[PDB]
Coordinates of C-alpha atoms and ligand atoms in Angstrom, one line a residue:
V1 CA 124.5 107.0 120.1
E2 CA 125.1 110.7 120.6
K3 CA 125.6 112.2 117.1
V4 CA 124.9 115.5 115.4
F5 CA 121.1 115.6 114.6
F6 CA 121.2 115.8 110.8
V7 CA 118.0 117.2 109.1
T8 CA 117.7 118.1 105.4
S9 CA 115.4 119.8 102.9
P10 CA 115.4 118.6 99.3
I11 CA 117.8 120.6 97.0
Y12 CA 115.6 122.6 94.6
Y13 CA 115.9 122.9 90.8
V14 CA 117.2 126.3 89.8
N15 CA 115.2 126.5 86.5
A16 CA 112.9 129.0 88.2
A17 CA 112.5 131.3 91.1
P18 CA 111.9 130.5 94.8
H19 CA 108.2 129.9 95.4
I20 CA 106.2 128.6 98.4
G21 CA 106.9 124.9 97.7
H22 CA 110.6 125.5 98.5
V23 CA 109.9 127.9 101.4
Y24 CA 107.5 125.3 102.9
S25 CA 110.0 122.3 102.7
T26 CA 112.8 124.4 104.1
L27 CA 110.5 125.8 106.8
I28 CA 109.8 122.1 108.0
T29 CA 113.4 121.4 107.9
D30 CA 114.2 124.6 109.9
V31 CA 111.6 123.9 112.6
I32 CA 112.8 120.3 113.1
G33 CA 116.4 121.8 113.4
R34 CA 115.4 124.5 115.8
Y35 CA 113.4 122.0 118.0
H36 CA 116.5 119.8 118.5
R37 CA 118.6 122.9 119.3
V38 CA 116.0 124.0 121.9
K39 CA 116.2 120.4 123.3
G40 CA 119.9 121.1 123.6
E41 CA 121.2 118.8 121.0
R42 CA 123.9 119.3 118.2
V43 CA 122.2 120.2 114.9
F44 CA 123.2 120.3 111.3
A45 CA 120.4 121.5 109.0
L46 CA 121.0 121.4 105.2
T47 CA 119.3 123.0 102.3
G48 CA 120.4 124.0 98.7
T49 CA 120.1 124.0 95.0
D50 CA 120.2 121.3 92.3
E51 CA 121.9 123.0 89.4
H52 CA 122.8 120.3 86.8
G53 CA 120.4 118.8 84.3
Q54 CA 118.8 119.0 80.8
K55 CA 115.9 120.9 82.4
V56 CA 118.2 123.6 84.0
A57 CA 120.3 124.1 80.8
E58 CA 117.1 124.4 78.6
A59 CA 115.8 127.0 81.0
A60 CA 119.1 128.9 80.9
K61 CA 118.9 128.6 77.1
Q62 CA 115.5 130.3 77.3
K63 CA 117.0 133.4 79.1
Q64 CA 119.8 133.3 76.5
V65 CA 122.6 133.2 79.2
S66 CA 125.3 130.6 80.0
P67 CA 124.3 127.8 82.5
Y68 CA 127.1 129.0 85.0
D69 CA 125.5 132.5 84.9
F70 CA 122.0 131.3 85.2
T71 CA 122.5 128.9 88.1
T72 CA 124.7 131.3 90.1
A73 CA 122.1 133.9 89.8
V74 CA 119.0 131.6 90.7
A75 CA 121.0 130.2 93.5
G76 CA 121.4 133.7 94.8
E77 CA 117.8 134.3 94.5
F78 CA 117.3 131.1 96.7
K79 CA 119.8 132.2 99.3
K80 CA 118.2 135.6 99.7
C81 CA 114.8 134.2 100.0
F82 CA 115.9 131.9 102.8
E83 CA 117.7 134.8 104.6
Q84 CA 114.5 136.9 104.3
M85 CA 112.3 134.1 105.8
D86 CA 114.6 134.0 108.8
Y87 CA 115.6 130.4 108.9
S88 CA 118.5 129.1 110.8
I89 CA 119.9 126.6 108.3
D90 CA 123.5 125.6 108.9
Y91 CA 124.7 125.3 105.3
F92 CA 123.5 126.0 101.7
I93 CA 124.8 123.3 99.3
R94 CA 125.1 123.6 95.5
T95 CA 125.7 120.8 93.1
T96 CA 128.0 122.9 90.9
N97 CA 130.3 123.0 94.0
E98 CA 133.6 121.2 93.4
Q99 CA 133.6 119.3 96.7
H100 CA 130.2 117.9 95.8
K101 CA 131.5 116.6 92.4
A102 CA 134.3 114.8 94.2
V103 CA 131.9 113.0 96.4
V104 CA 129.7 112.0 93.5
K105 CA 132.8 110.6 91.6
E106 CA 133.7 108.8 95.0
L107 CA 130.3 107.3 95.3
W108 CA 130.0 106.4 91.6
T109 CA 133.3 104.5 91.7
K110 CA 132.3 102.7 94.9
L111 CA 129.1 101.5 93.1
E112 CA 131.1 100.5 90.0
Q113 CA 133.6 98.4 92.1
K114 CA 130.8 96.6 93.8
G115 CA 129.5 95.3 90.3
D116 CA 126.3 97.3 90.8
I117 CA 126.9 99.6 87.8
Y118 CA 127.0 98.1 84.1
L119 CA 126.7 99.4 80.6
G120 CA 123.3 98.9 79.1
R121 CA 120.4 100.6 77.3
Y122 CA 117.4 102.6 78.4
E123 CA 114.6 102.4 75.8
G124 CA 111.5 104.2 77.4
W125 CA 109.7 107.3 78.5
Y126 CA 111.2 110.2 80.4
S127 CA 109.8 113.5 82.0
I128 CA 112.4 116.2 81.5
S129 CA 110.7 118.4 84.1
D130 CA 110.6 115.7 86.8
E131 CA 114.0 114.2 85.6
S132 CA 112.2 110.9 86.1
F133 CA 112.1 107.5 84.3
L134 CA 108.5 106.4 83.7
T135 CA 107.0 103.0 82.6
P136 CA 104.2 103.1 80.0
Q137 CA 101.5 102.6 82.8
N138 CA 102.5 106.0 84.2
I139 CA 101.7 108.0 81.0
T140 CA 98.5 109.2 79.2
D141 CA 97.4 111.8 76.6
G142 CA 97.4 115.6 77.0
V143 CA 98.6 118.9 75.6
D144 CA 101.8 121.0 75.1
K145 CA 102.2 124.8 75.5
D146 CA 101.7 124.7 71.7
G147 CA 98.6 122.6 72.5
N148 CA 99.3 119.5 70.3
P149 CA 98.4 115.8 70.8
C150 CA 101.4 114.8 73.0
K151 CA 101.8 112.4 75.9
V152 CA 102.2 113.5 79.6
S153 CA 103.3 112.0 83.0
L154 CA 100.4 110.7 85.2
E155 CA 102.5 111.8 88.2
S156 CA 103.1 115.4 87.3
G157 CA 101.3 116.2 84.0
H158 CA 104.5 117.6 82.4
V159 CA 105.5 116.5 78.8
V160 CA 107.2 113.2 78.3
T161 CA 109.5 112.2 75.5
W162 CA 110.8 108.7 74.4
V163 CA 114.5 108.1 75.0
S164 CA 116.7 105.4 73.4
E165 CA 120.2 105.7 74.8
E166 CA 123.0 103.4 75.7
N167 CA 123.3 104.2 79.4
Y168 CA 125.3 103.0 82.5
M169 CA 122.6 101.1 84.5
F170 CA 122.4 100.7 88.3
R171 CA 121.2 97.1 89.4
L172 CA 118.3 98.3 91.4
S173 CA 116.5 95.0 90.7
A174 CA 119.0 93.4 93.0
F175 CA 118.1 95.5 96.0
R176 CA 114.2 94.7 96.1
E177 CA 114.5 92.1 98.9
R178 CA 117.0 94.2 101.1
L179 CA 114.7 97.3 100.6
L180 CA 111.7 95.4 101.8
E181 CA 113.6 94.1 104.8
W182 CA 114.5 97.8 105.7
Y183 CA 110.9 99.0 105.4
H184 CA 109.4 96.0 107.4
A185 CA 112.3 96.3 110.1
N186 CA 111.9 100.0 110.6
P187 CA 108.2 100.9 110.4
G188 CA 108.7 104.5 111.4
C189 CA 111.2 105.2 108.6
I190 CA 108.7 106.6 106.0
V191 CA 106.1 109.2 107.3
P192 CA 103.2 109.4 107.1
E193 CA 102.1 105.8 107.2
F194 CA 100.0 105.8 104.1
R195 CA 103.1 106.9 102.1
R196 CA 105.1 104.2 103.7
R197 CA 102.5 101.7 102.4
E198 CA 102.7 103.3 99.0
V199 CA 106.4 102.7 98.7
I200 CA 106.2 99.2 100.0
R201 CA 103.6 98.1 97.5
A202 CA 105.6 99.6 94.7
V203 CA 108.8 97.6 95.6
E204 CA 106.8 94.4 96.0
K205 CA 105.5 94.8 92.4
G206 CA 109.2 94.5 91.3
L207 CA 112.1 96.9 90.5
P208 CA 113.6 97.5 87.1
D209 CA 117.4 98.6 86.8
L210 CA 117.9 102.3 87.0
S211 CA 119.6 104.2 84.3
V212 CA 122.2 106.5 86.1
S213 CA 124.0 108.0 83.1
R214 CA 123.1 109.9 80.0
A215 CA 124.9 110.7 76.8
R216 CA 126.5 114.2 77.3
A217 CA 124.9 115.7 74.1
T218 CA 121.4 115.1 75.6
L219 CA 122.3 117.1 78.7
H220 CA 123.8 120.0 76.8
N221 CA 127.0 119.0 78.8
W222 CA 125.5 120.6 81.9
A223 CA 126.4 117.8 84.3
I224 CA 129.1 115.8 86.1
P225 CA 131.3 113.6 83.8
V226 CA 131.2 109.8 84.5
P227 CA 134.5 108.8 86.1
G228 CA 136.7 107.3 83.2
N229 CA 134.0 107.8 80.5
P230 CA 133.6 111.5 79.5
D231 CA 131.2 110.6 76.7
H232 CA 128.5 110.1 79.5
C233 CA 127.3 112.3 82.3
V234 CA 125.9 111.4 85.7
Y235 CA 122.0 111.3 86.2
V236 CA 121.0 114.5 87.8
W237 CA 119.2 112.4 90.6
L238 CA 122.4 110.4 91.7
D239 CA 124.2 113.8 91.6
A240 CA 121.3 115.3 93.5
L241 CA 120.7 112.7 96.1
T242 CA 124.4 112.6 96.9
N243 CA 124.1 116.3 98.2
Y244 CA 123.2 114.8 101.6
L245 CA 126.5 112.8 101.7
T246 CA 128.5 115.8 100.6
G247 CA 126.8 117.9 103.2
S248 CA 127.6 115.5 106.0
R249 CA 131.4 115.8 105.1
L250 CA 131.8 119.6 104.8
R251 CA 133.4 121.6 107.5
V252 CA 131.8 125.1 107.6
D253 CA 133.2 128.3 109.1
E254 CA 131.6 131.3 111.0
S255 CA 130.1 133.0 107.9
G256 CA 128.6 129.8 106.4
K257 CA 131.0 129.2 103.6
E258 CA 132.5 125.6 103.3
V259 CA 136.2 125.3 104.0
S260 CA 137.2 121.6 103.9
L261 CA 135.8 118.2 102.8
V262 CA 136.6 115.3 105.2
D263 CA 137.4 111.9 103.9
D264 CA 135.4 109.9 106.4
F265 CA 131.8 110.9 107.1
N266 CA 132.2 109.6 110.6
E267 CA 134.5 112.5 111.4
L268 CA 131.6 115.0 111.7
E269 CA 129.0 112.6 113.2
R270 CA 126.3 113.7 110.7
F271 CA 125.7 110.9 108.3
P272 CA 123.1 109.5 108.0
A273 CA 120.3 111.9 108.1
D274 CA 117.9 111.6 111.1
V275 CA 115.2 113.2 109.0
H276 CA 114.9 113.9 105.2
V277 CA 112.1 116.4 104.5
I278 CA 110.7 116.1 101.1
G279 CA 107.6 116.7 99.0
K280 CA 105.4 113.7 97.8
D281 CA 106.5 114.3 94.3
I282 CA 110.0 112.9 95.1
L283 CA 109.2 110.1 97.4
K284 CA 110.5 107.2 95.2
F285 CA 113.9 108.8 94.6
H286 CA 114.4 109.2 98.5
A287 CA 112.7 105.9 99.7
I288 CA 113.8 103.5 96.8
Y289 CA 116.8 104.8 94.9
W290 CA 118.7 106.5 97.6
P291 CA 118.6 103.6 100.2
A292 CA 119.7 101.2 97.4
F293 CA 122.6 103.4 96.4
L294 CA 123.6 103.5 100.1
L295 CA 123.1 99.7 100.5
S296 CA 125.4 99.1 97.4
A297 CA 128.1 101.4 98.8
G298 CA 127.9 99.9 102.3
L299 CA 126.8 103.3 103.9
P300 CA 124.2 103.6 106.6
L301 CA 120.6 104.3 105.7
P302 CA 118.7 107.4 107.0
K303 CA 116.4 107.1 110.0
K304 CA 113.2 108.9 108.7
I305 CA 111.9 110.3 105.4
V306 CA 109.0 112.6 105.9
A307 CA 106.9 113.5 102.8
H308 CA 104.4 116.4 102.8
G309 CA 101.3 117.4 100.9
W310 CA 102.7 120.3 98.7
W311 CA 104.5 119.8 95.4
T312 CA 108.2 120.7 95.6
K313 CA 108.3 121.9 91.9
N314 CA 96.9 132.9 91.4
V315 CA 100.1 134.1 93.0
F316 CA 101.1 133.4 96.7
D317 CA 104.5 135.1 97.4
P318 CA 105.6 134.1 101.0
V319 CA 107.8 137.2 101.5
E320 CA 104.9 139.5 100.6
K321 CA 102.4 137.8 102.9
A322 CA 105.0 137.7 105.7
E323 CA 105.4 141.5 105.4
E324 CA 101.6 142.0 105.5
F325 CA 100.8 139.6 108.6
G326 CA 104.1 138.9 110.2
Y327 CA 107.0 136.4 109.7
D328 CA 106.3 134.0 112.6
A329 CA 102.6 134.3 112.0
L330 CA 102.9 133.0 108.4
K331 CA 105.1 130.1 109.4
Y332 CA 102.5 129.4 112.1
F333 CA 99.8 129.3 109.6
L334 CA 101.6 127.0 107.2
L335 CA 102.5 124.5 109.8
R336 CA 99.1 124.6 111.6
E337 CA 96.8 124.7 108.6
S338 CA 98.0 121.5 106.8
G339 CA 99.1 118.0 107.8
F340 CA 100.2 115.5 105.4
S341 CA 97.2 115.2 103.1
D342 CA 97.5 118.6 101.3
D343 CA 93.8 119.7 101.4
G344 CA 93.9 122.7 103.6
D345 CA 92.8 126.3 103.0
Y346 CA 95.3 129.1 102.4
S347 CA 93.1 132.1 101.9
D348 CA 93.6 135.4 103.6
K349 CA 90.4 135.0 105.3
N350 CA 91.6 132.0 107.0
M351 CA 95.1 133.3 108.0
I352 CA 93.3 136.2 109.6
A353 CA 91.0 133.8 111.4
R354 CA 94.1 131.9 112.7
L355 CA 96.0 135.1 113.5
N356 CA 93.0 136.6 115.5
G357 CA 91.5 133.5 116.9
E358 CA 94.7 131.6 118.0
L359 CA 97.8 133.9 117.9
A360 CA 96.1 137.1 119.2
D361 CA 93.1 135.9 121.3
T362 CA 94.7 132.6 122.7
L363 CA 98.4 133.3 123.1
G364 CA 98.8 137.0 122.8
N365 CA 95.9 137.8 125.1
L366 CA 97.2 135.5 127.7
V367 CA 100.6 136.9 127.6
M368 CA 99.2 140.4 128.3
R369 CA 96.9 139.2 131.2
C370 CA 99.6 137.6 133.2
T371 CA 102.1 140.6 132.7
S372 CA 99.8 143.6 133.0
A373 CA 100.4 146.2 135.9
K374 CA 96.6 145.8 136.8
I375 CA 96.8 142.0 137.6
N376 CA 100.6 141.5 138.2
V377 CA 100.9 144.4 140.6
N378 CA 104.6 143.8 141.6
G379 CA 105.8 143.0 138.0
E380 CA 107.3 139.6 139.1
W381 CA 106.6 135.9 139.3
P382 CA 104.8 135.6 142.7
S383 CA 105.3 132.6 145.1
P384 CA 102.3 130.3 144.9
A385 CA 100.1 129.4 147.9
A386 CA 98.4 126.0 148.3
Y387 CA 96.9 124.4 145.1
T388 CA 93.2 123.6 144.6
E389 CA 92.2 120.4 142.6
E390 CA 91.4 122.7 139.7
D391 CA 94.9 124.3 140.0
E392 CA 96.3 120.7 139.9
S393 CA 94.3 119.8 136.9
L394 CA 95.9 122.6 134.9
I395 CA 99.3 122.0 136.3
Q396 CA 99.1 118.3 135.3
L397 CA 98.4 119.4 131.6
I398 CA 101.3 121.7 131.7
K399 CA 103.7 118.9 133.0
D400 CA 102.4 116.4 130.5
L401 CA 102.8 118.8 127.5
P402 CA 106.6 118.5 126.9
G403 CA 106.4 114.7 126.6
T404 CA 103.5 114.9 124.2
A405 CA 104.9 117.6 122.1
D406 CA 108.3 115.8 122.0
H407 CA 106.6 112.6 120.6
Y408 CA 104.8 114.8 117.9
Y409 CA 108.1 116.7 117.0
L410 CA 109.9 113.4 116.7
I411 CA 107.4 111.6 114.3
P412 CA 107.7 114.3 112.9
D413 CA 104.2 115.8 113.0
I414 CA 104.5 119.5 113.5
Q415 CA 100.8 120.3 113.1
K416 CA 99.9 117.9 116.0
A417 CA 102.6 119.4 118.1
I418 CA 101.2 122.9 117.6
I419 CA 97.7 121.7 118.4
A420 CA 98.9 120.0 121.6
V421 CA 100.4 123.3 122.8
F422 CA 97.3 125.3 121.8
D423 CA 95.1 122.7 123.7
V424 CA 97.0 123.6 126.9
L425 CA 96.9 127.4 126.0
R426 CA 93.1 127.2 125.6
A427 CA 93.0 125.4 129.0
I428 CA 95.0 128.1 130.7
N429 CA 92.6 130.8 129.2
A430 CA 89.7 128.8 130.7
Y431 CA 91.4 128.7 134.1
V432 CA 92.0 132.5 133.9
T433 CA 88.5 133.3 133.0
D434 CA 87.3 131.1 135.7
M435 CA 89.6 132.4 138.4
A436 CA 89.1 136.0 137.4
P437 CA 92.5 137.2 138.7
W438 CA 91.5 140.9 137.9
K439 CA 88.9 140.6 140.8
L440 CA 91.4 138.9 143.1
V441 CA 93.7 141.9 143.4
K442 CA 91.0 143.5 145.5
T443 CA 89.4 140.6 147.3
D444 CA 92.1 137.8 147.7
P445 CA 95.9 138.4 147.2
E446 CA 96.9 135.2 148.8
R447 CA 94.9 133.4 146.0
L448 CA 96.1 135.6 143.1
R449 CA 99.7 134.6 143.8
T450 CA 98.8 130.9 143.1
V451 CA 96.6 131.7 140.0
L452 CA 99.3 134.1 138.4
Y453 CA 102.3 131.8 139.1
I454 CA 100.5 128.9 137.3
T455 CA 99.5 131.2 134.5
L456 CA 103.1 132.4 134.0
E457 CA 104.5 129.0 134.1
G458 CA 101.9 127.7 131.7
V459 CA 102.7 130.5 129.4
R460 CA 106.5 129.9 129.6
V461 CA 106.3 126.1 128.9
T462 CA 103.9 126.6 126.0
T463 CA 106.2 129.4 124.6
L464 CA 109.2 127.1 125.1
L465 CA 107.6 124.3 123.0
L466 CA 106.3 126.9 120.5
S467 CA 109.7 128.5 120.0
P468 CA 110.6 126.5 116.9
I469 CA 107.4 127.8 115.3
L470 CA 107.5 131.4 116.6
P471 CA 111.2 131.9 117.0
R472 CA 111.1 135.8 117.2
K473 CA 107.8 136.2 119.1
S474 CA 109.0 133.5 121.6
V475 CA 111.9 135.8 122.4
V476 CA 109.6 138.8 122.8
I477 CA 107.4 136.6 125.1
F478 CA 110.2 135.5 127.2
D479 CA 111.5 139.1 127.5
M480 CA 108.1 140.3 128.8
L481 CA 108.0 137.4 131.2
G482 CA 111.6 138.1 132.3
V483 CA 112.9 134.6 131.7
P484 CA 116.7 134.4 132.0
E485 CA 118.4 133.2 128.7
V486 CA 119.7 129.9 130.4
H487 CA 116.0 128.9 131.0
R488 CA 115.0 129.4 127.3
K489 CA 116.5 126.1 126.1
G490 CA 117.4 122.7 127.3
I491 CA 115.3 119.7 128.5
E492 CA 115.9 120.8 132.0
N493 CA 113.6 123.7 131.5
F494 CA 110.7 121.7 130.0
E495 CA 110.0 120.9 133.6
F496 CA 107.3 122.8 135.7
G497 CA 108.7 125.4 138.0
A498 CA 112.1 126.0 136.4
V499 CA 111.9 129.8 136.8
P500 CA 111.8 130.5 140.4
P501 CA 109.4 133.0 142.1
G502 CA 110.9 136.5 142.6
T503 CA 112.0 136.6 138.9
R504 CA 111.4 140.1 137.7
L505 CA 109.4 140.8 134.4
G506 CA 110.8 142.7 131.5
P507 CA 110.0 146.3 131.1
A508 CA 106.9 147.2 129.2
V509 CA 106.3 149.3 126.2
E510 CA 103.3 151.7 126.6
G511 CA 101.9 150.6 123.2
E512 CA 103.3 147.2 122.8
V513 CA 101.2 144.5 121.1
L514 CA 102.5 141.0 120.6
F515 CA 100.1 140.1 117.7
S516 CA 97.8 142.8 116.3
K517 CA 94.3 141.7 115.1
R518 CA 93.4 142.4 111.5
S519 CA 90.0 143.2 109.9
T520 CA 87.6 140.6 108.4
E521 CA 88.0 142.0 104.8
Ligands
LIG601 C1 117.8 115.1 96.1 S1 116.5 116.5 96.3 C2 116.2 116.8 94.5 C3 114.9 117.5 94.3 C4 114.6 118.2 93.0 N1 115.8 118.9 92.6 C5 113.4 119.1 93.0 O1 113.5 120.4 92.9 O2 112.3 118.7 93.3

């Protein structure tokens, strides 16, 4: 089916300021989005804030301001951060939004009508900071900010409290079999695989019913009322997970403000998400609860959930570090340095290593070589002569790259996609050192044409597939290479030889550097 490619970040709690956790999650969302736009598809990327809850109100209480003021402000801080980071997210959703609340009421009522919601009790442990229900096996001893003998979550380490409330309960136990079918039938639906195996083991152990309402007093009334029972409020997580459904039904205008909420999700061709980007901290909510709610309501399940190494909830300010090293450079580092186990190194020493070693020396260097007036004497893409077997060996790599990178982007594994491109860049540099085109201006012009054309085309294709990672620098590179706008996106232009010979380069700046190297501290 030809739909809108729907990619989402998680919606972040507004109890605190934007930090790297959120910037990272939304960066992954943004890159996936951009890739599918470069591929020439329709894209809706969603991000936003998660504004109801005991945890938010109790943080608004701390600053001694009303919940409406505190959330609006922090939401603003989030919006500004994402504009500074230079994402291309299509909409910013807020759970305080009135359209969103309508959708939550719709969904709640649908679940009630199915007989999947009932009035019961929850008597157990709860982490206010995680907004998570925990069994006694998931808790152990620890300390509070006041350093007293309290209990804490094994998951997160935040403080837990015992809760004994009469709650509206969701019949999650009844969705154990159908969830297991979904996992085993769609083995790519949770990524990476070891997290898929985690979710499956957990559901096989057994599922308790899930409390989906709280008594309004406990939430400091900062929540959505349960339809037809204002004594209770809706669990922040059913509220929160529903943002994806809300998002898929909002018409948005030129400026990014929402204007209309359609009745039927099919009208906009967005639901369900093709990728949900999340941190490992919130895997169970997205891989167990969410599909069960959607199963209950007769809605379609998402295609992929990708859970990364960081935690979604010693200073490291992204906006500071981007101002010091470059914006695209930082994004490159975060996407290249870590896969899906979180153990990677985020020191300056390392970023500089990757900035100099890879962005400057591999990519940047190569861009300057194939454009410089010394080597490229006519300032154009020359017409190639006949190809050696060494020429063919490089061309073959260039031709294979798009398919390879495409499979990686689709997993999705953005680290592996980058690596695949840089493998081809390293190869092109090797070909250039070997060919030595700087010598060939004097001795052999017929040959230089061939060498230079291949270089240029390798640089174009590598740059095209890197454009979701380095969106600004890719534009600068293409300008230098003189690539017409039409050839900068679309699967058509993944093919070798898309730009014809005789294409003129962009004008040069006598002092232009693509990536400037920085000192080993
Ligand atoms: C439905 S995504 C909710 C995520 C949660 N608000 C967090 O910040 O981790």
